[PDB]
Structure 1
Amino acid sequence: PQITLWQRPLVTIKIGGQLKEALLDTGADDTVLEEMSLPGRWKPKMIGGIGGFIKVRQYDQILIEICGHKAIGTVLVGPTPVNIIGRNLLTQIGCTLNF
């Protein structure tokens, strides 16, 4: 699909058996979601953006489906204001910027 940027590029994702709305963010190195439970081991990480850093939990090798496309990758969980799909997963679904 071709997604215009007149509005925020929000899409539905499927993760941990849950359906959520997330923002396709080319400016984000990683994917970070609001508090939720995920399987497996995790390690702490500090990620920074406008306003500073927040501490999140890092889960690796997590299966996610973005707008119909399946992928696997690292997913961070923490106090993010909105669910964000970063480059680590955008690449997997073949997402590109075009102009």
Structure 2
Amino acid sequence: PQFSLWKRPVVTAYIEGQPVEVLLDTGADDSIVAGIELGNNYSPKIVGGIGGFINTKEYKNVEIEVLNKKVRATIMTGDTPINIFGRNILTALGMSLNL
């Protein structure tokens, strides 16, 4: 699949079965999602962006189904306006940015 970038590269992903719309983001080191419950196996983490920092709960080894691929990766939950799938997930998928 090729994303031309004329529109936001958004797809539907399944995180432990829960469907979520995420943005494929090359400018994010991590993945952060809002609105899903993942349980008690987390450590609190601080993540910084353009307007400042935010607290998140970091879950490691979460099962993710996206673009017909299945991967286990770290996911953070927190107050984000858009669900982000950063490089930790993009590299696992084998996705690249081409010029």
TM-score, normalised via structure 1 length: 0.96
- How many Å apart are 1:39 and its aligned residue? 3.9
Q: CA deviation at 1:15?
A: 1.0
Q: Report whether the alignment pairs 1:61 with 2:61.
A: yes
Find the residue that maps to 1:91 and give its secondary structure: helix
Which residue type is aligned with residue 6 of structure 2? W
Q: Deviations over 1:6-62 (max 9, x none)?
A: 000001101121111100000000000003111451000010011000100000010
In the other structure, the counterpart of 2:44 is: 44
Match of 1:33 in 2: 33
Runs of 4+ in 1 over 4 A off after TM superposition: none
How far apart, CA to CA, are the structure 1 residues paired with 2:87 and 2:66? 13
Gaps of 5+ in 2: none
The number of equivalent residue pairs is 99
Distance in structure 2 (CA, Å) of the matches to 1:6 and 1:35: 27
Aligned match of 1:9: 9
Residue type matched to 2:42 in 1?
A: W
TM-score (norm 2): 0.96
